[PDB]
Amino acid sequence: AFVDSIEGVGEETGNKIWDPLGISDAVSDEAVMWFRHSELKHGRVAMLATVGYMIGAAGITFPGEIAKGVTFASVGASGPYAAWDATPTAGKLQILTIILALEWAAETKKPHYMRGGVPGKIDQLPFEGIPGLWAPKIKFWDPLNFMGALTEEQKARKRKSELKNGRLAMIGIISFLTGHNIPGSVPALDSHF
Amino acid sequence: VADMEGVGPETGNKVFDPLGLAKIASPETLAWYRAAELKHSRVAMAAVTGWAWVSSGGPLFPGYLSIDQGITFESLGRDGYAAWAAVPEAGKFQILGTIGILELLQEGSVKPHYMAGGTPGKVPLLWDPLGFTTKLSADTLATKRTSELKNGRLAMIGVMSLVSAHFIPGSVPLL
Amino acid sequence: SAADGMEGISHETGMKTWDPLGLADLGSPATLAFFRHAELKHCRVAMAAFVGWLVAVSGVHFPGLCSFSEGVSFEDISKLTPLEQWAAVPALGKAQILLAIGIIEHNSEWKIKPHYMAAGGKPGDLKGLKSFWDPAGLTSKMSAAKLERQRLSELKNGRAAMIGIISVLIAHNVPGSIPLPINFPAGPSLILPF
Amino acid sequence: AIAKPSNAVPFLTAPPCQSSKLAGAETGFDPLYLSEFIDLKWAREAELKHGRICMLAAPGYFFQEFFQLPGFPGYSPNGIEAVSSVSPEALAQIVIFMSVIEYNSNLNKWTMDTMFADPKREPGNLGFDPLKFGENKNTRARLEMAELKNGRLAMLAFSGMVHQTFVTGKPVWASLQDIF
Amino acid sequence: MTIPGVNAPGLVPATKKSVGPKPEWDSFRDTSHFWSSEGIMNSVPKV
Ligand code: CLA
Ligand SMILES: CC(=O)O[C@H]1CC(C)(C)C(=C=C/C(C)=C/C=C/C(C)=C/C=C/C=C(C)/C=C/C=C(\C)C(=O)C[C@@]23O[C@]2(C)C[C@@H](O)CC3(C)C)[C@](C)(O)C1
Ligand SMILES: CC(=O)O[C@H]1CC(C)(C)C(=C=C/C(C)=C/C=C/C(C)=C/C=C/C=C(C)/C=C/C=C(\C)C(=O)C[C@@]23O[C@]2(C)C[C@@H](O)CC3(C)C)[C@](C)(O)C1
Ligand SMILES: CC(=O)O[C@H]1CC(C)(C)C(=C=C/C(C)=C/C=C/C(C)=C/C=C/C=C(C)/C=C/C=C(\C)C(=O)C[C@@]23O[C@]2(C)C[C@@H](O)CC3(C)C)[C@](C)(O)C1
Ligand code: KC2
């Protein structure tokens, strides 16, 4: 929320708030919550996308039969860029609707993030507490509870690392897509991608 | 970590964690690891015993596996991968469905979940329903659990050795 | 929930009342008594129906003829699939079978004065209709704990039976539902009563 | 600087329906302020009746393509040519059944004043509750709000199904699956 | 139907018509919806 309390300050920009254009000074502190929720969501989606894109460029795919006749290698033949278009529309819709359920359940939680909740703290158990619905209580984030061994300071440091790696992953995934769309724009990319 | 079972005098009588995976584990993560280890060990023991029994001769099932297709257990092949391929796909599907309903019952029927404060890798639905080993002492039960973990890990090695012999026959000795 | 004192807690789901959608909480104790009476009726009808379906598949039939007027022998009717058997029963025979069933249901709701949707419910209690349930007194040898066990077994068997009857009825009509490859009898999954 | 803004359209004044005790009142959705003109109880009686009809219709319209009443003549998977093809003396009997129910339920109370002349008589409380869910008064508000919302959604859904069938000429599920 | 995103690209690039000579004022005035006799008639709602 308030641009201050948030933890994202790091050594790369000096130990200060990095707001060159003063976007944070023209908001009423209600929108800074939305910006840290969206920043963390962007960073997390971006690092997932980055590792997935690197996997696709390397050519690693599942053993086969994404669908009935289609194979994983065949549907990822033309690199990772066209892989999404190649994937079956039905499975595409199932990915989209499970993401819809996740991102609707995350929004429906009572404290929210904009209205006085933690911006970034996705609820661990999105589908519980819903009358008339049942799910097998598998918590969305950290299902195996890796974070129990971590103390407060350690998880603060790891949240800092999360923000840094998410920002770097945003830069990386945009580099990948831009390098594909404009050859030679990202010189560290080979013909694989 | 040391409170849990599996540790024995072979590996210096201390926890075998060369990569330090137990140090990043909460109590529940340790429960998940132990449950996975138990399930893998017993699956590997069943698999290696079945593979050795089939490949080393001995008795086989007497009758047919499918009257409509007329497949005999003798004609399956008496070797692991090819026999499993020759099993009808419907038979494979219903075997996997039986295992799936068993595991869904294991997850949703035992009320104290092994992750949520229950014993890791216990099946009160299915373990000696008539009580073959129920009256034994607690110390003998615990050391028998230790034996289970030990030879079940050895069975993991055995079944993976059999798979690596099937796919890379020049790797293992013998076989 | 409202479903704690009720006698239906199983050993398979654990000793907690399996009401994942919380339908027991929604409504009155009268509503839950209606639910219990409906469950027991479905249980009993499903046990009788599965036995009847097994009889029809086996082909065993009464020696005689259904109607001396119409040329409808039990031997003739046994050759059809189980639901076409009822479709082939005479209209008047079906009418009087339903008349007997409806008389039984009306008297169950009438003569059992402490109603299931009322104080002193006794939801599945149809004893009170004298000589209807257990005319021979077979359960009369049983104590309280044995009676409770038998009631729990009734509910378990009937629940399984109402699953199984629908399973056999739909398995052939929609192939691939039941994983087993047994060739279930053909025919409808639903018959209109007349 | 609206003194009493509408909870739904906060740039408009609060309608009379917002300051009322019927169920679902807080939304306050009434841009046209029809609650000031129309009698509010009479419109909840109409809202509930329409929603009940529509939430019987929408499952019926959506499942009559998939399923047939065994042996029924004149069946067509799409509702419009279904009603065109079905014998008129079946639709007539359905309408007679509905009319009998309406007349006997609303006997001597068919006008805005005659209906709700009795202070007890509530909007849409015709007394149809064989299983007596209404005796439990803890969940009565939940069930009332759920009935209202489901009825409204069913009105919109049935309208959409019917007009999509008009657009495409094909039943609801076929028209939907030919998009993806 | 081409659902943009799943069975079709989200946004297709537009046709770059290239920089070239200007049109004539009469050319785009005798086709306007308000200063052309047929343009006026082509501006009535079809419905
Ligand atoms: C607005 C409501 C509505 C209307 C006007 C119609 C109209 C029609 N339906 Mg029906 N239908 C409806 C709802 C409706 N349906 C619903 C909800 C279903 C369940 C999915 C069906 C399922 C259905 C089928 C499968 C078929 C029709 C067909 C027809 C046509 C012939 C009549 C017939 O056979 O009805 C049959 C009626 C039923 C099978 C049941 C109707 C359910 C009623 C409305 C529920 C009300 C009772 C209530 C729930 C009980 C309370 C119990 C309490 C006392 C305890 C006709 C165009 C036939 C067709 O396609 O012709 C072209 C046909 O074969 N309908
Ligand atoms: C050199 C040159 O010229 O150009 C360069 C520039 C250019 C184009 C930008 C390039 C690029 C791309 C870049 C920079 C890509 C960066 C990608 C990035 C930064 C990707 C992060 C992923 C993070 C993940 C998946 C995290 C998982 C995290 C998980 C699963 C966890 O929760 C771990 C954890 O649970 C444990 C196990 C237990 C605890 O102990 C701690 C926690 C709870 C946290 C190139 C190719 O380098 C070339
Ligand atoms: C030099 C050398 O060796 O090279 C090897 C190395 C290499 C490559 C690894 C090889 C291998 C594979 C090996 C060694 C594989 C070994 C596999 C192994 C050793 C597999 C055990 C299974 C045990 C089972 C199924 C036990 C069930 C036990 C059951 C059913 C019970 O319930 C037990 C119990 O009822 C009792 C009996 C008494 C009760 O009180 C307690 C209970 C109720 C619990 C090669 C290829 O062979 C060559
Ligand atoms: C997995 C898969 O794919 O398929 C599987 C699962 C699936 C689909 C469900 C299948 C099915 C169908 C199933 C399982 C069907 C089950 C049917 C069932 C369970 C049917 C019970 C009838 C009971 C009656 C009539 C009892 C009357 C008993 C009466 C009237 C008594 O007097 C009892 C009595 O106690 C008293 C009251 C007093 C005592 O003094 C005397 C006795 C003891 C006599 C399959 C295809 O088969 C196999
Ligand atoms: C542990 C696993 C398991 C269970 C729990 C289980 C239970 C039941 C039940 C009890 C409810 C019935 C009623 C039943 C019936 C049939 N089973 Mg089945 N079965 C299991 C495993 C296998 C395997 C491996 C095969 C198989 C088959 C058949 C055939 C086919 C006969 C034929 O085609 O002549 C029929 C009729 C074979 C097959 O489908 O071959 C194409 C086949 O290979 N089953 N099976």
PDB file of N, CA, C and O in Angstrom, chain A residues 168-190:
ATOM      1  N   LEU A 168      13.112  -9.130 -13.097  1.00  0.00           N
ATOM      2  CA  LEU A 168      14.052  -9.634 -14.090  1.00  0.00           C
ATOM      3  C   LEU A 168      13.357 -10.557 -15.082  1.00  0.00           C
ATOM      4  O   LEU A 168      13.663 -10.539 -16.279  1.00  0.00           O
ATOM      5  N   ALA A 169      12.404 -11.357 -14.607  1.00  0.00           N
ATOM      6  CA  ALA A 169      11.680 -12.264 -15.487  1.00  0.00           C
ATOM      7  C   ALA A 169      10.764 -11.510 -16.436  1.00  0.00           C
ATOM      8  O   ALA A 169      10.564 -11.937 -17.576  1.00  0.00           O
ATOM      9  N   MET A 170      10.165 -10.414 -15.971  1.00  0.00           N
ATOM     10  CA  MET A 170       9.387  -9.563 -16.865  1.00  0.00           C
ATOM     11  C   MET A 170      10.252  -9.068 -18.011  1.00  0.00           C
ATOM     12  O   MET A 170       9.877  -9.171 -19.191  1.00  0.00           O
ATOM     13  N   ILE A 171      11.431  -8.537 -17.674  1.00  0.00           N
ATOM     14  CA  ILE A 171      12.354  -8.078 -18.709  1.00  0.00           C
ATOM     15  C   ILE A 171      12.716  -9.228 -19.641  1.00  0.00           C
ATOM     16  O   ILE A 171      12.742  -9.066 -20.866  1.00  0.00           O
ATOM     17  N   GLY A 172      12.965 -10.413 -19.081  1.00  0.00           N
ATOM     18  CA  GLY A 172      13.385 -11.538 -19.901  1.00  0.00           C
ATOM     19  C   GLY A 172      12.315 -12.014 -20.868  1.00  0.00           C
ATOM     20  O   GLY A 172      12.597 -12.282 -22.038  1.00  0.00           O
ATOM     21  N   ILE A 173      11.075 -12.140 -20.394  1.00  0.00           N
ATOM     22  CA  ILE A 173      10.017 -12.650 -21.261  1.00  0.00           C
ATOM     23  C   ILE A 173       9.690 -11.636 -22.350  1.00  0.00           C
ATOM     24  O   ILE A 173       9.435 -12.008 -23.508  1.00  0.00           O
ATOM     25  N   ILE A 174       9.692 -10.344 -22.010  1.00  0.00           N
ATOM     26  CA  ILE A 174       9.476  -9.357 -23.061  1.00  0.00           C
ATOM     27  C   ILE A 174      10.634  -9.370 -24.042  1.00  0.00           C
ATOM     28  O   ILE A 174      10.433  -9.173 -25.245  1.00  0.00           O
ATOM     29  N   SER A 175      11.856  -9.616 -23.563  1.00  0.00           N
ATOM     30  CA  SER A 175      12.982  -9.758 -24.475  1.00  0.00           C
ATOM     31  C   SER A 175      12.768 -10.921 -25.428  1.00  0.00           C
ATOM     32  O   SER A 175      13.042 -10.806 -26.623  1.00  0.00           O
ATOM     33  N   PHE A 176      12.273 -12.048 -24.917  1.00  0.00           N
ATOM     34  CA  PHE A 176      12.051 -13.215 -25.769  1.00  0.00           C
ATOM     35  C   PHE A 176      11.031 -12.911 -26.857  1.00  0.00           C
ATOM     36  O   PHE A 176      11.275 -13.153 -28.049  1.00  0.00           O
ATOM     37  N   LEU A 177       9.877 -12.368 -26.464  1.00  0.00           N
ATOM     38  CA  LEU A 177       8.830 -12.101 -27.448  1.00  0.00           C
ATOM     39  C   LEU A 177       9.269 -11.041 -28.454  1.00  0.00           C
ATOM     40  O   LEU A 177       9.044 -11.188 -29.664  1.00  0.00           O
ATOM     41  N   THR A 178       9.907  -9.967 -27.979  1.00  0.00           N
ATOM     42  CA  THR A 178      10.372  -8.924 -28.884  1.00  0.00           C
ATOM     43  C   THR A 178      11.460  -9.443 -29.813  1.00  0.00           C
ATOM     44  O   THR A 178      11.510  -9.065 -30.985  1.00  0.00           O
ATOM     45  N   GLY A 179      12.351 -10.295 -29.307  1.00  0.00           N
ATOM     46  CA  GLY A 179      13.389 -10.851 -30.152  1.00  0.00           C
ATOM     47  C   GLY A 179      12.826 -11.732 -31.244  1.00  0.00           C
ATOM     48  O   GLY A 179      13.331 -11.744 -32.368  1.00  0.00           O
ATOM     49  N   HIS A 180      11.774 -12.490 -30.930  1.00  0.00           N
ATOM     50  CA  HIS A 180      11.114 -13.258 -31.981  1.00  0.00           C
ATOM     51  C   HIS A 180      10.470 -12.337 -33.009  1.00  0.00           C
ATOM     52  O   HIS A 180      10.637 -12.525 -34.220  1.00  0.00           O
ATOM     53  N   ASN A 181       9.729 -11.326 -32.545  1.00  0.00           N
ATOM     54  CA  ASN A 181       8.972 -10.493 -33.477  1.00  0.00           C
ATOM     55  C   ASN A 181       9.876  -9.602 -34.323  1.00  0.00           C
ATOM     56  O   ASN A 181       9.529  -9.284 -35.465  1.00  0.00           O
ATOM     57  N   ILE A 182      11.019  -9.188 -33.784  1.00  0.00           N
ATOM     58  CA  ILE A 182      11.959  -8.292 -34.455  1.00  0.00           C
ATOM     59  C   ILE A 182      13.325  -8.970 -34.425  1.00  0.00           C
ATOM     60  O   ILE A 182      13.992  -8.922 -33.382  1.00  0.00           O
ATOM     61  N   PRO A 183      13.781  -9.626 -35.497  1.00  0.00           N
ATOM     62  CA  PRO A 183      15.063 -10.338 -35.413  1.00  0.00           C
ATOM     63  C   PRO A 183      16.225  -9.387 -35.165  1.00  0.00           C
ATOM     64  O   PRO A 183      16.279  -8.284 -35.711  1.00  0.00           O
ATOM     65  N   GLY A 184      17.158  -9.830 -34.327  1.00  0.00           N
ATOM     66  CA  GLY A 184      18.324  -9.047 -33.986  1.00  0.00           C
ATOM     67  C   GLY A 184      18.123  -8.033 -32.883  1.00  0.00           C
ATOM     68  O   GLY A 184      19.093  -7.374 -32.490  1.00  0.00           O
ATOM     69  N   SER A 185      16.901  -7.879 -32.367  1.00  0.00           N
ATOM     70  CA  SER A 185      16.671  -6.919 -31.295  1.00  0.00           C
ATOM     71  C   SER A 185      17.281  -7.385 -29.981  1.00  0.00           C
ATOM     72  O   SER A 185      17.723  -6.556 -29.179  1.00  0.00           O
ATOM     73  N   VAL A 186      17.309  -8.691 -29.747  1.00  0.00           N
ATOM     74  CA  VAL A 186      17.915  -9.290 -28.568  1.00  0.00           C
ATOM     75  C   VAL A 186      19.040 -10.208 -29.039  1.00  0.00           C
ATOM     76  O   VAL A 186      18.807 -11.370 -29.369  1.00  0.00           O
ATOM     77  N   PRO A 187      20.288  -9.718 -29.089  1.00  0.00           N
ATOM     78  CA  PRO A 187      21.342 -10.489 -29.772  1.00  0.00           C
ATOM     79  C   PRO A 187      21.701 -11.802 -29.100  1.00  0.00           C
ATOM     80  O   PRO A 187      22.375 -12.626 -29.729  1.00  0.00           O
ATOM     81  N   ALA A 188      21.284 -12.029 -27.857  1.00  0.00           N
ATOM     82  CA  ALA A 188      21.620 -13.240 -27.125  1.00  0.00           C
ATOM     83  C   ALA A 188      20.629 -14.374 -27.366  1.00  0.00           C
ATOM     84  O   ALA A 188      20.532 -15.281 -26.532  1.00  0.00           O
ATOM     85  N   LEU A 189      19.900 -14.345 -28.479  1.00  0.00           N
ATOM     86  CA  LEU A 189      18.919 -15.364 -28.827  1.00  0.00           C
ATOM     87  C   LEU A 189      19.317 -16.012 -30.143  1.00  0.00           C
ATOM     88  O   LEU A 189      19.645 -15.314 -31.109  1.00  0.00           O
ATOM     89  N   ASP A 190      19.278 -17.338 -30.180  1.00  0.00           N
ATOM     90  CA  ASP A 190      19.682 -18.113 -31.340  1.00  0.00           C
ATOM     91  C   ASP A 190      18.458 -18.438 -32.198  1.00  0.00           C
ATOM     92  O   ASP A 190      17.349 -17.955 -31.950  1.00  0.00           O
TER      93      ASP A 190
END
